[PDB]
With several copies, the nearest count.
Chain A
Amino acid sequence: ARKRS
């Protein structure tokens, strides 16, 4: 669960 730009 990592951020997506």
Chain B
Amino acid sequence: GTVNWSVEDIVKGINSNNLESQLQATQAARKLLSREKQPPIDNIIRAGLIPKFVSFLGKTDCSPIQFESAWALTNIASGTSEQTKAVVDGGAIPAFISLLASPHAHISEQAVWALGNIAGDGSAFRDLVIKHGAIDPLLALLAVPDLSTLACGYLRNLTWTLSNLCRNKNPAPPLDAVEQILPTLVRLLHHNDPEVLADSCWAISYLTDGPNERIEMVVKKGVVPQLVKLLGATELPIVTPALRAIGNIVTGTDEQTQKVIDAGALAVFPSLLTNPKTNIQKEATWTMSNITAGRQDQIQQVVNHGLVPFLVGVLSKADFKTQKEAAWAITNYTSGGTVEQIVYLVHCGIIEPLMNLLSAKDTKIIQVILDAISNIFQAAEKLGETEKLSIMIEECGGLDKIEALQRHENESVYKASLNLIEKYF
């Protein structure tokens, strides 16, 4: 029937003045654009069919052609920025927004999907979708007493498109649009479907990836406890965005970090810092590095939760990027911590792995490690235990690494190693 049409035949049908022939040709185009391998998007565009599809979007009297054209345009918009732009230049944005209020659920869903692709192109098309007025009808679709009454796929597509409206930076989404969307996002974050939860967490992670004012907009909604709960989830597609959001939040002020701590986040990090997924371990260690950059009482809560041994473990064995995040966490700890906290760090066995990491080629991790060593030596000075620390570093083989770095190409490493050797060895 409408399977395996040539683009020539699609054009001939769409150019007929017979609405049923146009419908059949548009369905043939939809099937062609829905094929697994190499959908001929560019051929359809070059055939000049986008304006016809856009006009069909407005055929309220023929819902089937509305649906078929919406699907075809969705799939065109799913491609490169040039193809998405071709869809936008045809006038598709206001037509899809008008379809959001269709009485046919599959047509409304298809319009949601298409607007999601368009907004997902980037900040410019995101903001253009917003300016055409998409947020109000989108959120109206979710204004029901119980989200569970909605079809699962419909709700997932709505959540995904909203997440794209929260996505991208330079610029970040308009503040008023974020304020308009956030309440529905909180509600979705309490939903039970794993994909809705994952995409809601992704949206929150986008919204917290910015200055402290954006983070504050999010944390004011009271979502941090739910984020920590989701951080404890079994589904990795949920844990990943939840952890990203928590890390973003702890890049903010000490009070926002404290909201994360008060919600119980630290209790999850024994598992996260040993998680078999390398990305989770790296992100959790980065989050820890930003928590140890906080107040001394926050460092103390890190200590009380027993997380220093886990940082020693990650420093001792992990993917190198995770080890660099751990080196950062240790340097922040030693920069902000009390003398007692630093000596505790030493008692947990930090020196040996910290020195073993000095064999790395990355210059920045070497600088970080040397800064940490200097801070630890300063605490030792305050206690008159500099000699014990020097003996420890010499026994683990770190003095050799430092005296070798004395001949390092970078100036900072050179000077820091020379200072350490001349001052304590």
Direct contact of A and B (CB under 8 A): yes
Are B251 and A1 in contact (CB-based, < 8 A)? no
Are A1 and B252 in contact (CB-based, < 8 A)? no
Give chain B residues whose Cβ lies under 8 Å from the Cβ of A3: 250-252, 290, 293
B-contacting residues, A1-5, CB 8 Å: 1-5
Give chain A residues whose Cβ lies under 8 Å from the Cβ of B335: 1
Are B336 and A1 in contact (CB-based, < 8 A)? yes
Number of interface residues of B (CB under 8 A): 17
Interface of chain B, main secondary structure: helix
Give chain B residues whose Cβ lies under 8 Å from the Cβ of A1: 292-294, 331-333, 335-336
Interface of chain A, main secondary structure: loop
Give chain A residues whose Cβ lies under 8 Å from the Cβ of B160: none
CB distance from B86 to the nearest CB of A (A): 35
Select from chain A the residue with minimum beta-carbon distance to B295: A1
CB distance from B237 to the nearest CB of A (A): 23
Select from chain A the residue with minimum beta-carbon distance to B332: A1
A-contacting residues, B231-271, CB 8 Å: 248, 250-252
- Mask of B276-296 contacts with A, CB within 8 angstroms, 1/0: 000000000010011011100
Select from chain A the residue with minimum beta-carbon distance to B291: A3
| B328 close to A (CB within 8 Å) | yes
Most chain-B Cβ atoms within 10 A of its Cβ — which of A2, A3, A5?
A3
CB distance from A2 to the nearest CB of B (A): 6
Give chain A residues whose Cβ lies under 8 Å from the Cβ of B248: 5
Are B251 and A4 in contact (CB-based, < 8 A)? yes
A-contacting residues, B335-364, CB 8 Å: 335-336
Give chain B residues whose Cβ lies under 8 Å from the Cβ of A5: 209, 248, 251
Are B292 and A4 in contact (CB-based, < 8 A)? no
CB distance from A1 to the nearest CB of B (A): 4
Q: Which listed residue (B209, B252, B328, B333) contacts A4, Cβ 8 A?
A: B328
Select from chain A the residue with minimum beta-carbon distance to B337: A1
CB distance from B112 to the nearest CB of A (A): 32
CB distance from B331 to the nearest CB of A (A): 8
Give chain A residues whose Cβ lies under 8 Å from the Cβ of B333: 1
Are B286 and A4 in contact (CB-based, < 8 A)? yes
Most chain-B Cβ atoms within 10 A of its Cβ — which of A1, A2, A3, A4?
A1
CB distance from B329 to the nearest CB of A (A): 10
Give chain A residues whose Cβ lies under 8 Å from the Cβ of B331: 1
Give chain B residues whose Cβ lies under 8 Å from the Cβ of A4: 251, 286, 289-290, 293, 328
Give chain A residues whose Cβ lies under 8 Å from the Cβ of B292: 1
Select from chain B the residue with minimum beta-carbon distance to A2: B293
Select from chain A the residue with minimum beta-carbon distance to B257: A3
CB distance from B302 to the nearest CB of A (A): 13
Give chain A residues whose Cβ lies under 8 Å from the Cβ of B209: 5
Select from chain A the residue with minimum beta-carbon distance to B331: A1
CB distance from B358 to the nearest CB of A (A): 21
Q: Apart from A1-B335, A2-B293, A4-B251, what 6 extra A-B contacts exist at CB < 8 Å?
A: A1-B293, A1-B333, A3-B293, A5-B209, A5-B248, A5-B251
Closest 6 CB pairs of A and B: A1-B335, A1-B336, A1-B293, A1-B332, A3-B251, A5-B251
Query: Can you give 6 A-B contacts (C-beta < 8 A)?
Result: A3-B250, A3-B252, A4-B286, A4-B290, A5-B248, A5-B251
Q: Which residues of A contact B (CB under 8 A)?
A: 1-5
